[PDB]
Design a binder for this molecule. Structure first.
Ligand SMILES: Nc1ncnc2c1ncn2[C@@H]1O[C@H](COP(=O)(O)OP(=O)(O)OP(=O)(O)O)[C@@H](O)[C@H]1O
Ligand SMILES: Nc1ncnc2c1ncn2[C@@H]1O[C@H](COP(=O)(O)OP(=O)(O)OP(=O)(O)O)[C@@H](O)[C@H]1O
Ligand SMILES: [Mg+2]
Ligand SMILES: [Mg+2]
Ligand SMILES: [Mg+2]
Ligand SMILES: [Mg+2]
Ligand SMILES: [Mg+2]
Ligand SMILES: [Mg+2]
Ligand SMILES: [Mg+2]
Ligand SMILES: [Mg+2]
Ligand SMILES: [Mg+2]
Ligand SMILES: [Mg+2]
Ligand SMILES: [Mg+2]
Ligand SMILES: [Mg+2]
Ligand SMILES: [Mg+2]
Ligand SMILES: [Mg+2]
Ligand SMILES: [Mg+2]
Ligand SMILES: [Mg+2]
Ligand SMILES: [Mg+2]
Ligand SMILES: [Mg+2]
Ligand SMILES: [Mg+2]
Ligand SMILES: [Mg+2]
Ligand SMILES: [Mg+2]
Ligand SMILES: [Mg+2]
Ligand SMILES: [Mg+2]
Ligand SMILES: [Mg+2]
Ligand SMILES: [Mg+2]
Ligand SMILES: [Mg+2]
Ligand SMILES: [Mg+2]
Ligand SMILES: [Mg+2]
Ligand SMILES: [Mg+2]
Ligand SMILES: [Mg+2]
Ligand SMILES: [Mg+2]
Ligand SMILES: [Mg+2]
Ligand SMILES: [Mg+2]
Ligand SMILES: [Mg+2]
Ligand SMILES: [Mg+2]
Ligand SMILES: [Mg+2]
Ligand SMILES: [Mg+2]
Ligand SMILES: [Mg+2]
Ligand SMILES: [Mg+2]
Ligand SMILES: [Mg+2]
Ligand SMILES: [Mg+2]
Ligand SMILES: [Mg+2]
Ligand SMILES: [Mg+2]
Ligand code: NA
Ligand code: NA
Length: 552
RNA sequence: AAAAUGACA
RNA sequence: CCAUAGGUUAAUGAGGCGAACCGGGGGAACUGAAACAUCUAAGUACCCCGAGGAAAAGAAAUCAACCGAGAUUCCCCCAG
RNA sequence: UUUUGUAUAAUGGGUCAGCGACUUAUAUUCUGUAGCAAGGUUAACCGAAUAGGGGAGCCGAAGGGAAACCGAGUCUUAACUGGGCGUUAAGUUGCAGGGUAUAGACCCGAAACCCGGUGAUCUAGCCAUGGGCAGGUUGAAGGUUGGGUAACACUAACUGGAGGACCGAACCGACUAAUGUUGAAAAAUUAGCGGAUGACUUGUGGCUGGGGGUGAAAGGCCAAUCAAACCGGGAGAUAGCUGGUUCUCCCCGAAAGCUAUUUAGGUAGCGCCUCGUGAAUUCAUCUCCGGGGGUAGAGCACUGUUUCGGCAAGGGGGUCAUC
RNA sequence: GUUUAUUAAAAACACAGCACUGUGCAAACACGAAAGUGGACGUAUACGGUGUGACGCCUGCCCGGUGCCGGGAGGUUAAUUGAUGGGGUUAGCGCAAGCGAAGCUCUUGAUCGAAGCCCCGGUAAACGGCGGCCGUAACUAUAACGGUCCUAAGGUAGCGA
RNA sequence: UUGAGCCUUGAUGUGUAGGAUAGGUGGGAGGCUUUGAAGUGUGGACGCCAGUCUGCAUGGAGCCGACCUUGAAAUACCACCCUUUAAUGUUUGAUGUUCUAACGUUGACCCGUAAUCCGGGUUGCGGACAGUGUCUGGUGGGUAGUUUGACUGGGGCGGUCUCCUCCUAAAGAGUAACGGAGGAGCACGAAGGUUGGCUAAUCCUGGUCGGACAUCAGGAGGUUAGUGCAAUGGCAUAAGCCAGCUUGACUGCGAGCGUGACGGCGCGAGCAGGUGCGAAAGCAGGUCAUAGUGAUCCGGUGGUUCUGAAUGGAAGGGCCAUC
RNA sequence: CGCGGGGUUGAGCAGCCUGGUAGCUCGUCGGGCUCAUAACCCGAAGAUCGUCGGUCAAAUCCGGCCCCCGCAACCA
């Protein structure tokens, strides 16, 4: 009884093609409930989040929150100001209190003035004597000095342009949170965070009540916090009570049963078609009712929209012994040194996984490798046979006003990958972009579809020193494993930057571990062999967490 | 663990 | 001994019949809809119970419209 | 009579005489006639009552708009120089008539549905009771006495009298043929045929009732009637379907087409007929004038097809670098 | 032995025998608005239903469809229950405007909620089903044999114009 | 045995730096401490792991406030506790086991009674189940009511049913067959409106890769080109091709006509209010035209006090737009 | 001929599924293992997707031509 924070009733949704990404989803939520939303890229999870937060009311059905609840919505790709700084971007969040202090000091100026002393005050200041109290505008200074510690935000002077990818998400998380809301709706909240930040956030989420609906492709992240699982497969809402391991078997069972029913329906249709095509045998019935039943049996069902399979990677020029060695590399920004005295040499035909904290120079390394930057010391020495192909860390380089096919190919009926040409339509189709899904504008694309398309567009240079900067951005399990199996077959060299060590556990052959002081160390092997190295030359240190919290 | 066959003189 | 159930005994009443009309309990289908299932035929035919010279109803928890009328029953309009 | 069409070998009629089919309330529209006339007229009812009262009410004299509302105007519209509907031409009540509506609705005619009752004296099954089956055969189990065994088993003679057993009359049936089909008979006669101690047959009396009975099962039987008995009622069910429709004279006089249709043999609007009113040199023939055609015919520049020339691509079988 | 009384007496019906299935007794089942009767003054060696039809030798493979039996985890799931949001009215604050307490009403429908169905097994003397194309051996006549596709399984014994 | 709620008792709340696990206001202040210390073992939950709460060991008379070096201060009552939970009460819900008193008894005995019916009385056995009533989901040819189109060179099977183009079609319009051939159930915020500008297919000669055919140059050419999609009629003033600015793909009307049996469908100058393009004259109420479709009823969503059943409101209607 | 289905490597089959992407098992050819052959291992080849033709795009759509495989020919 009681409770019942949020409700959805027969909430359909129709997209321009014709299909219903959501149809007949009727369910309710309760205080202090954690829901994890699963599905595939295209299942409608982000649209459901937008509806639940109330951004869009173009539904059929009802979607009601209980009155007097604060809703914090974290979207797929939060948009900030490339002009702002961290200080003036975070300061926006607590807006009713900065103006409260400013106006209170101005009223402290104007109150001693004998002009309308009993008119300009009783009507105006009184509306602020509690805006400074309920929100507590006096102690925002210590509030920020404390809340900065937990996230370990970038420096206040830092600019958004100078900010790195993970720190940007950190800032956005602080901005969203500071409102102290009840409903917390997040769409993939841990896109760029490392082990420390992800563990901290998934402890804080579990502690924090008020109901949290989280989109996540990460089994380990979901297991800690989720008390309920929403499936959201093909326009249906399947609620599961349990953990990921128990739900995965039920999902597989459902798929197997649906395939069996499909086969049975096929066989029935063959059997009835034979009778329909038989003769007449005299002046007898032929059964108009039976004909109507057979005609009704010809219905349609949705195949799983993207059971995407192994991607395409076209290798290019043959590559020799020199694989762009690096000697005495040192990098800094003003006085902030990222890397000092780094020297290594990648072998031939290897995959090199790069690991480290947020804003430790990982993207900077690719920047100076691709010629965008320069080294403050030493030199990187390219091999003359080396072809470069580096994937940008951010999806935000496409133009949202163009079609998928036009964006990838360039408006050419035949483009070329590497040296051989092959048709552009086939080249895109190799990335599971069928002819129907060809026509959607790249601004109308899910996160995973956008990532796949951007990867497909950039990988057409036909190079052989693939500098992947987090290709595992918004990839599902099957989408991830397709590329994970395609990469192991790459002839050329692959340098991969990522935060999820489980993906790298299957593909990495060389390791670049970042550390403090700007220390970057090379290693040859996989992560189990790295653990073997640590255990052979060990050190007793496991006291990672402290749980700073936010409020006093 | 698997292991079939070889015209007459 | 309880006491009830019960069995003889007396006087008083009703049993059945009859044409129509009347009140009550049940209650069709053919037909029309140019087929038909909601609907109409129709609370009609028919069955059953009960009286009376008539029977039922009947003295506002009724209408009306800020003006008012005064139980019930039947006839002519309202009005197809 | 029905038809495109009948001497038709298409229907109906043996003949006379009698009977037999467009009617009757009410309502509405039009026509003729009669009375009053911007008015006309009453209903129920009262009444020594076809009179006289009764004007409740109905129609008409004003329309427009969905409505408020306005008013010889109104609606539309922000508004019409507009545009739709109206003003400017008399109605109402009887009588007679032609239509339409609700009633059986011009008359005769179904197979069928529903309701209440009468039927198991014929026939289905079953229940209680008591009769019938001439005559002649065959030899089961069993038993006794002998043989055989340690005992059995087995065996021989005698005896015995079983059976949906055998042949065959009464009795019960009904396989073949002939006769008879306005019969002797609304299922029989004649010569043959099956069962004939049994799951038999028969007398008397009971029980099962109509969407129900009973059925050694055929949709068989339930009073000569059964894929739902008979009698009465709803009931003059419905019939876009056949048949029939009664005295006389004068005038005019068609259609078998289009569109639509659960529609093709029905119906509805229009085209074709008749009666009445009002109107224009209204309409028809002919001569002259102003028109636009793309048919018949003709033709091959075009779309195609068709031969014969002289040119000429270009090409194919061999001969070739037989790259 | 029985049957279409009145055009069909039969290969049809019945039958003894066989099998499956239900039924623990106030039995299943049938006639009955019900009381109550038959079953039966019987009691699983009994009674009802269905198929086959003495006797002899036998009765092969398939649980995919459709029925039946068992399971209860999960999905869906009625009546009841009426939390919530929206709307109407208005005592008042205003006296232009608008807001709107308590009550009363219209609507919306949170939670709870069984059997069935989905799902998991069995069952064929339960209703039923029981394959294609191509090559191959001293006359190329045919295939003991092989290749491949599909099925729930590919017709066995015995018969066969 | 338990889910859930409620009320009271306890406990828990470690950013940095003051002192070191500290949630908020307190109200203000030293009082707590002696139902026997700060101190001496450790009980145990937890921890961010320094320890702070707490069972028991003798004695049993102790800490801080205040100063504040940080934003804030001193666990030294009680308050809705604001947070986790830990309990005992406590209401409700479920799942169970036990009982007797409703109820069942087609178990035994007794009486009415000379009665295997019925009733009553004792006694067992079940027992809040079973059973019945109302509501409700499933199943339900066991039973009942009906439907199952038309054209058609007889019916059935086959084909077809609405719209557009050509021919049949007889030089106005219309005109049939199960006659001869093809299409449609759309698209376009530009492919629409103006203002500027431009004009094709094919063939030849020359020329880098490059040829039979890509781009370039100049000659013949003269619409054999093109139209957003079938065919016919059109198109150079282009209705074809290329750009700018654009929203007339406007609102209310509409002289007068074409075509339909009707429902309806089509063309339309001009008038009023605003609008775009152009220097203006002017053009623009969709697309070169002809297919791209569905009446009424019922209901949904916006606007409008037109109406609002005693009155004021409201529900519900009406009208306009639309599904 | 009235109505349906089919045609893909040397054999049997997918892929026609709403067009951008020609595959499978056996078999042919060349090596290897073995005294030698089968089996087994390794490596290759080839298909105008029946045909005439008409969608940016087909094996995939549609019309036709060719051949093959089934079905129906009822009431008198
Ligand atoms: N205009 C459009 N036309 C066609 N498809 C569209 C259009 N707009 C959205 N879609 C489709 O609707 C779906 C929206 O999915 P959504 O944005 O929820 O992402 P997701 O794949 O469910 O989740 P996530 O990216 O967060 O992992 C996608 O499949 C997207 O392609
Ligand atoms: N132009 C710049 N000016 C100042 N600082 C910069 C600039 N570019 C990068 N940095 C700093 O360099 C550091 C590394 O940034 P980088 O882009 O390499 O991040 P990263 O390690 O890849 O992080 P992430 O996890 O977000 O991918 C950060 O601290 C960032 O603020
Ligand atoms: Mg009497
Ligand atoms: Mg009728
Ligand atoms: Mg009729
Ligand atoms: Mg009386
Ligand atoms: Mg005639
Ligand atoms: Mg004739
Ligand atoms: Mg003649
Ligand atoms: Mg005659
Ligand atoms: Mg004659
Ligand atoms: Mg005749
Ligand atoms: Mg005659
Ligand atoms: Mg009027
Ligand atoms: Mg009937
Ligand atoms: Mg008898
Ligand atoms: Mg005998
Ligand atoms: Mg007989
Ligand atoms: Mg005889
Ligand atoms: Mg005999
Ligand atoms: Mg005899
Ligand atoms: Mg008879
Ligand atoms: Mg009948
Ligand atoms: Mg009648
Ligand atoms: Mg009659
Ligand atoms: Mg005449
Ligand atoms: Mg007819
Ligand atoms: Mg000619
Ligand atoms: Mg016999
Ligand atoms: Mg007979
Ligand atoms: Mg006979
Ligand atoms: Mg009994
Ligand atoms: Mg048999
Ligand atoms: Mg259930
Ligand atoms: Mg029936
Ligand atoms: Mg009827
Ligand atoms: Mg017909
Ligand atoms: Mg003509
Ligand atoms: Mg003409
Ligand atoms: Mg155009
Ligand atoms: Mg121009
Ligand atoms: Mg134009
Ligand atoms: Mg056009
Ligand atoms: Mg009112
Ligand atoms: Mg309204
Ligand atoms: Na998303
Ligand atoms: Na980065």
């Amino acid at each position: 009884m009681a409770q019942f924070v949020y409700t959805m009733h027969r909430v359909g949704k129709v997209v321009p093609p014709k299909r219903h990404i959501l149809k007949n989803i009727s369910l309710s939520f309760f205080p202090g409930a954690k829901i994890g939303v699963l599905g595939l890229n295209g299942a409608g999870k982000s649209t459901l989040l937008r509806i639940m937060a109330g951004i869009d009311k173009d539904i059929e059905g009802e979607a009601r929150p209980q009155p007097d609840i604060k809703i914090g919505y974290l979207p797929q790709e939060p948009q900030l100001n490339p002009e702002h700084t961290v200080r003036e971007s975070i300061e926006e969040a607590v807006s009713e209190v900065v103006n409260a202090l400013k106006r209170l000091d101005e009223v402290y100026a104007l109150y001693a003035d004998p002009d309308a002393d009993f008119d300009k005050l009783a009507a105006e200041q009184g509306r602020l004597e509690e805006i400074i109290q309920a929100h507590d505008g006096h102690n925002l200074n210590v509030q920020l000095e404390r809340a900065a510690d937990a996230l370990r935000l970038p420096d206040w002077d830092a600019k958004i342009a100078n900010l790195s990818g993970g720190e940007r998400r950190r800032v956005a998380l602080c901005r969203l949170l500071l409102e102290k809301p009840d409903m917390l709706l997040l769409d993939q909240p841990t896109n760029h965070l490392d082990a420390e930040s992800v563990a901290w956030l998934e402890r804080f989420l579990h502690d924090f009540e008020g109901t949290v609906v989280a989109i996540t492709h990460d089994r380990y992240f979901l297991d800690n916090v989720a008390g309920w699982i929403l499936e959201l497969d093909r326009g249906e809402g399947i609620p599961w009570e349990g953990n990921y391991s128990s739900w995965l078997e039920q999902k597989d069972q459902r798929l197997a049963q649906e395939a069996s029913q499909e086969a049975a329906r096929r066989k029935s249709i063959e059997k009835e078609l034979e009778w329909v095509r038989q003769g007449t045998k005299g002046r007898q019935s032929k059964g108009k009712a039976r004909l109507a039943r057979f005609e009704e049996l010809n219905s349609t069902e949705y195949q799983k929209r993207n059971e995407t399979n192994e991607l395409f990677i076209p290798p290019g020029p043959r590559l020799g012994d020199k694989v762009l060695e690096v000697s005495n590399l040192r990098k800094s920004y003003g006085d902030r040194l990222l890397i000092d005295s780094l020297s290594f040499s990648i072998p031939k035909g290897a995959i090199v996984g790069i690991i480290g904290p947020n804003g430790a120079g990982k993207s900077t390394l690719f920047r100076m490798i691709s010629g965008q930057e320069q080294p403050d010391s030493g030199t990187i020495t390219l091999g003359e046979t080396v072809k470069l192909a580096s994937v940008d860390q951010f999806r935000d380089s496409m133009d949202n006003s163009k079609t998928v096919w036009e964006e990838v190919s360039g408006g050419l009926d035949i483009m070329k990958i590497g040296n051989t040409e092959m048709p552009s339509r086939a080249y895109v189709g190799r990335f599971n972009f069928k002819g129907v899904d060809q026509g959607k504008r790249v601004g109308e694309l899910s996160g995973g579809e956008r990532g796949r398309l951007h990867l497909a567009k950039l990988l057409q240079v036909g190079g052989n020193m693939l500098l992947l900067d987090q290709p595992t951005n918004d990839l599902d399990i099957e989408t991830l494993r397709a590329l994970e199996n395609a990469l192991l077959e790459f002839p050329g060299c692959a340098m991969v930057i990522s935060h999820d060590r489980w993906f790298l556990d299957r593909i990495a052959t060389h390791i670049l571990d970042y550390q403090d002081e700007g220390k970057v160390e090379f290693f040859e092997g996989n992560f189990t062999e790295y653990e073997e190295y640590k255990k052979r030359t060990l050190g007793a240190d496991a006291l990672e967490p402290k749980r700073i919290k936010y409020k006093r």
